[PDB]
């Protein structure tokens, strides 16, 4: 369909970032897992995060995670890095060309 | 009970139980990088 | 693993810009492919498409992209070629490569294929 995710955050090192991406009509997955997480970073070609939300691994840093319920999908990054933030994306699934999302960058301050 | 192995090693340490889950080969994190490893091809039981 | 593209290109509106899409480390057959773009000022939008066992090439229906995808799996090089260019076409496009089958992905990503149709 069409989905929503949190804009931006402005936060401090060693920290979480809480992603919040927001799915318009259908929400998740049939079979209970769906979505998924991305990333594009400034300057950069676009990257691969987390699938169906809960999932991916090894290629994509132990900071990357979270989960999703429904609609909204939560890319939980903890101990934020202030060389490690960059716009990030999620894909549908399920329904309609899978786009991505308006994109989600978590700043960092000091 | 029914596997003989030459080698035995056995590494004994503390962690945080939410670290517990963390260790994993695959499975990276503070732990797997900084303060003790997983090998990536690891084989063999851990028991927390 | 690598994406290599074909390089920029600047039309006018209407026409039709080819690429290509070069693939580097992996087997280009199997695994989907697709073309996206990542426009200015904009979200990641999946446009293009391709299956790997099959030909799939369907798009965001809603304006065609329209853009001619076809593969050579002998040069491993997916095309765009995009049909109905306009002055949004200016963009930078990724052709991107799909996981094994699951809740995705596109693992990796093409560098971009800088696309600016205008006067």
């Known amino acids: 369909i069409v989905l929503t995710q949190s804009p931006t955050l402005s936060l401090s090192p060693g920290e979480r970032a809480t992603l919040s991406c927001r799915a318009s009509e259908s929400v998740d997955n049939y079979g209970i897992s769906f979505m998924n997480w991305f990333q594009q970073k400034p300057g950069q070609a676009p990257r691969l995060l987390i699938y169906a939300a809960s999932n991916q691994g090894s290629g994509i840093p132990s900071r990357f995670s979270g989960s999703g319920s429904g609609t909204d999908f939560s890319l939980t990054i903890s101990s934020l890095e202030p060389e490690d933030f960059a716009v990030y994306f999620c894909?549908?699934?399920?329904?309609?060309?899978?786009?991505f999302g308006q994109g989600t960058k978590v700043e960092i301050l000091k | 009970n029914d596997l003989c192995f030459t080698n035995v090693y056995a590494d004994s340490f503390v962690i945080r139980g939410d670290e517990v889950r963390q260790i994993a080969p695959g499975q990276t994190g503070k732990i797997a990088d900084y303060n003790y490893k997983l090998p990536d091809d690891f084989t063999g039981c851990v028991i927390a | 693993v690598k994406l290599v593209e074909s390089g920029g290109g600047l039309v006018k509106p209407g026409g039709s810009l080819r690429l290509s899409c070069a693939a580097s480390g992996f087997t280009f057959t199997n695994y989907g492919m697709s073309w996206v773009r990542q426009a200015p000022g904009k979200r990641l939008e999946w446009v293009a498409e391709?299956?790997?066992?099959?030909?799939?090439?369907y798009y965001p229906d809603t304006v065609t992209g329209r853009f001619t995808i076809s593969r050579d799996n002998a040069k491993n090089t997916l095309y765009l070629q995009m049909n109905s260019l306009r002055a949004e076409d200016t963009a930078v496009y990724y052709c991107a490569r799909f996981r094994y089958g699951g809740g995705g992905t596109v693992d990796y990503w093409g560098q971009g294929t800088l696309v600016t149709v205008s006067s």
């Open positions: 894909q549908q699934s399920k329904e309609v060309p899978r786009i």
């Open positions: 391709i299956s790997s066992g099959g030909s799939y090439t």
